[PDB]
Design a protein around this ligand. Sequence first.
Ligand code: HEM
Length: 154
Amino acid sequence: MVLSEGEWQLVLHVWAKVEADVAGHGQDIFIRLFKSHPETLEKFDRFKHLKTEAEMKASEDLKKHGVTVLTALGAILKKKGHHEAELKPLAQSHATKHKIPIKYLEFISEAIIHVLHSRHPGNFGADAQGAMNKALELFRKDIAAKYKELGYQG
Ligand code: HEM
């Protein structure tokens, strides 16, 4: 699949807003993910002890992790589809070291859309959400293909 320049513009326009507060968006997204799909929390040995949203918000390590994740995702989105090089190491660590099923990538994609919808309604209307979903589907599709080449079905 391929996004048009118009769709990329919608994606990058709302992403520019997210970059005004990467740490904050990172926390909201992971808290949403962990609360909505608690099973994903078990994949993080560093955070699986967190019991409440309050503890999650107060975790300095979780906040730093969120920044690392969103920074990596932002770099991929800014490539506008030409992300082969960026995807290689990400696909290897998540398939081989962390063992993250494609299903879980769908869950975090849902969390990202939910947070952008809540925080940026004016810049995240129907068309913008469709563009973001398409960009994330492309990401998940290419990651899945790499998973297979690497020997991980998940
Ligand atoms: C938007 C998709 C995602 C991106 C861009 C992303 C990115 C990253 C990055 C850059 C790191 C640090 C470097 C590395 O280990 O490769 C990381 C670590 C990790 N990711 Fe992801 N990730 C994504 C989704 C997920 C999901 C859905 C899970 C599982 C629910 C997951 C689990 C992990 C784990 C367990 C680590 C190691 C954390 C640690 O122990 O420090 N990731 N991820």
